[PDB]
């Protein structure tokens, strides 16, 4: 009686939302970008080859100085790389080898990681003893850790295999805010430039926009035919791309709340692993299971170029804050830099 | 020659780090990684107790071999999103409770719990991530199983089994049913063993099944097989 009433009402609200979205779809992004000149054939070459890992690499993140970067591999060690000289700065032994995510703090003072242990470990790099140590262990997730990103030296956002996402206070070590609503495992998240909003993708083929201060879902996005793995905010903070097992990247707009462009090719028979944007946002770089990475024109949706040189699936990607280089990681235990 | 005084010391630090990463890798390649699986009440507790958050790590040494067991039975998340992390383990230990032939799954609308364990075994065996990894099947609760079969026939689980309710025949039929799930018999082998709460001969069986796997993998790498 009341259950079916709530269900029909829900579907009525959803039809109303779909109609409201359609009402604003007067034109496609392709029609607007028709007059813009193409990007042309992109060319990038391997400038640095970083070795030292011995297992599958799963995560990597650039530092704010565009010179330092942290890499995570299931061999049990995190490595801080000097991308210019290739000299290792630190080697952090992991208490749990099965990590799948890593973050460099904006201040460069702390590093985070986690995985199947359901714990996010914070490592301090500026200890007076001259060695890295664990600052705090954030526990409370009922599932493997999927992604983590620093808001500040004391606040960090996290996502786990459990549908819940949480905002953590490092000083106290408790969840300041919890986010729920996903019907599937959350795989990745992306913080906005202003650090006031962030999006998260899950295996339910949906993406949700969250408010850090309030904690409510403001917008829900759909359109993917399979699990969403990667997600990245557009440099301006008004759009984000998502990568899926379906082999189709899609661009979503927040203000319009609709999909604007889809990036896919008939020869791509594999899913997406990582997504990133250039400093200008004109280039959309995505990692693919097929031992390569395609560069897509965000405006024209043309695959301008391809990056190759890995012997196994590309696990992670990252562009520097200055846009002078692009790092790539793969299960072959090698990390490379293009330019 | 073109480096400063401080830049020639960072190189030494990086070369000393590269020297400790390889020494640990050479220490992790001489160890046996064992993935542990099992359904509810599958006797996995007794197995781990006799042999010795999310992933649970248990380490032990038997006859100069260092083993590391990885219990993932507590991970309630999507298996296809983290099972690939264990690609390359030496072997997989699968625990099944024989007494489940008359116990329904948590969702009583579904098939028997033994059929659920069989489906899980089929899913984890015929997986693209473990086509080359062998499996070790421990059939738990044999003692109690021998008792219930006298009270409840085995046909409750297998309505097409035309045999006898004796312990030996029922156990052999269950073993055959579980072994027949191997769709890649030309590359994967299954080592079945019967265990109870009082038996302590499981670690030796694991040792033998791991030496056999190591021997066969060495022979295959050389291109002889």
């Amino acid at each position, epitope marked *: 009686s009341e259950l079916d009433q709530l269900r029909q009402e829900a579907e009525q609200l959803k039809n109303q939302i779909r109609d409201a979205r359609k009402a604003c779809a007067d034109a496609t992004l392709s029609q607007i970008t028709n007059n813009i000149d193409p990007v042309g054939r992109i060319q990038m070459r391997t400038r640095r080859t970083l070795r030292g890992h011995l297992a599958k690499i799963y995560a990597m993140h650039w530092g704010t100085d565009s*010179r*330092l970067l942290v890499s995570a591999s299931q061999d049990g060690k995190l490595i801080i790389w*000097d991308s210019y*000289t290739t*000299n290792k*700065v*630190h080697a952090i032994p992991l208490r749990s080898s099965w990590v799948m995510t890593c973050a460099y703090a904006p201040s*460069g003072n702390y590093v985070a990681c986690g995985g199947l242990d359901n714990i996010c470990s914070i490592y301090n790099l500026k200890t*007076r*003893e*001259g*060695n890295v140590r664990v600052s705090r262990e954030l526990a409370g997730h009922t599932g493997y850790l999927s992604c983590c990103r620093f808001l500040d030296d004391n606040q960090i956002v996290t996502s786990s295999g459990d549908t819940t996402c949480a905002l953590w206070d490092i000083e106290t070590g408790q969840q300041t805010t919890t986010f729920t609503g996903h019907t599937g495992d959350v795989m990745s998240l992306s913080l906005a430039p202003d650090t006031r909003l962030f999006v998260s993708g899950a295996c339910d083929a949906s993406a949700k926009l969250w408010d850090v201060r309030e904690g409510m879902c403001r917008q829900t996005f759909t359109g993917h035919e399979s699990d969403i793995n990667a997600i990245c905010f557009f440099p301006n903070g008004n759009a984000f791309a998502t990568g899926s097992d379906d082999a189709t990247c899609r661009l979503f707009d927040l203000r319009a709340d609709q999909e604007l462009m889809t990036y896919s090719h008939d020869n791509i028979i594999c899913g997406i692993t990582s997504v990133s944007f250039s400093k200008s946002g004109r280039l959309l770089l995505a990692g693919y299971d097929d031992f390569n990475c395609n560069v897509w024109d965000a405006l024209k949706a043309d695959r301008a170029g391809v990056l190759a040189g890995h012997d196994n699936r590309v696990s992670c990607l990252g562009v520097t804050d200055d846009g002078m280089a692009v790092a790539t990681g793969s299960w072959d235990s090698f990390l490379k830099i293009w330019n | 020659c*073109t480096l*400063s*005084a*401080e*830049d*020639k*010391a*960072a190189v*030494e*630090r990086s070369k*000393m780090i590269d020297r400790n990463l390889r020494e640990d890798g050479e220490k992790a390649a001489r160890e046996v990684k064992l993935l542990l699986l099992g359904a509810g009440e599958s006797g996995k507790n007794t197995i781990v107790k006799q042999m010795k958050t999310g992933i649970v790590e248990t380490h032990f040494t038997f006859k100069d071999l260092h083993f590391k067991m990885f219990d993932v039975g507590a991970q309630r998340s999507e298996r296809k999103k983290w099972i690939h992390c264990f690609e390359g383990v030496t072997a997989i230990i699968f625990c099944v409770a024989l007494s489940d032939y008359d116990l329904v799954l948590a969702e009583d609308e579904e098939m028997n719990r033994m059929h659920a364990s069989m489906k899980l075994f089929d899913s984890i065996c015929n997986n693209k991530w473990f086509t080359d990894t062998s499996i070790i099947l421990f059939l738990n609760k044999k003692d109690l199983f021998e008792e219930k079969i006298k009270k409840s026939p085995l046909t409750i689980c297998y309505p097409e089994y035309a045999g006898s309710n004796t312990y030996e025949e029922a156990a052999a039929y269950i073993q055959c049913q579980f072994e027949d799930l191997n769709k890649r018999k030309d590359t994967k082998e299954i080592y079945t063993h019967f265990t109870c709460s009082t038996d302590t001969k499981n670690v030796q069986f694991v040792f033998d099944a791991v030496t056999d796997v190591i021997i066969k993998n060495n022979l295959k790498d050389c291109g002889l097989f």
Partner: single-chain antibody
Amino acid sequence: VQLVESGGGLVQPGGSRKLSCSASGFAFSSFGMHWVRQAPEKGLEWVAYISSGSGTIYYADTVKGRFTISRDDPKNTLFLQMTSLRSEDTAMYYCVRSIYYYGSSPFDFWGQGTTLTVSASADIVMTQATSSVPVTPGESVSISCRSSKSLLHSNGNTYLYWFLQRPGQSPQLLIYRMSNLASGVPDRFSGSGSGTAFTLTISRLEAEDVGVYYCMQHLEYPLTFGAGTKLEL
């Protein structure tokens, strides 16, 4: 973090003596160690250096062959053997830790040092612009120094260091690489340079800012210290 030097004492001319230092409160094996001695007259001079791992050692042309440096990482101890002691060897020897990685601050911690008494070149010369500067608390002070060679390396870093040895205390790192302020130092201290001439500014002179300021170049070995600028109250 603490360094305790020991082994000093009176020695005959041409004798031998072995100094020892023990580290605590930090990873001794990760830091490189230096020996710096202060003659009876205020002034510093580099003696020797041993890298992390005992893979690189350097000595000064004034003691090389006569002195020897060694370390014991399993016990976090440092040693300095001496032979054919000259009359000029009388000085208070200090132990200094130094770790070299991107963003590190070498010479960050100085020990108390021990005193030793003896019974009766393309080196980059660093010259400070003033030996003593009378100043009272409240106003700013600008110390200056000059280098006989361009310390600005092609990598972009200017290997200039500033130290402050308060009366009866050990030197303290103020600024490293001519642009980075050391940890624990207040914002009163700042520095700049054009490549050959450098300056150290101290705003709002407090009561714990008097003493001899020593400049040091780290472009290459040997390490050369300045003549010292004593801010007297």
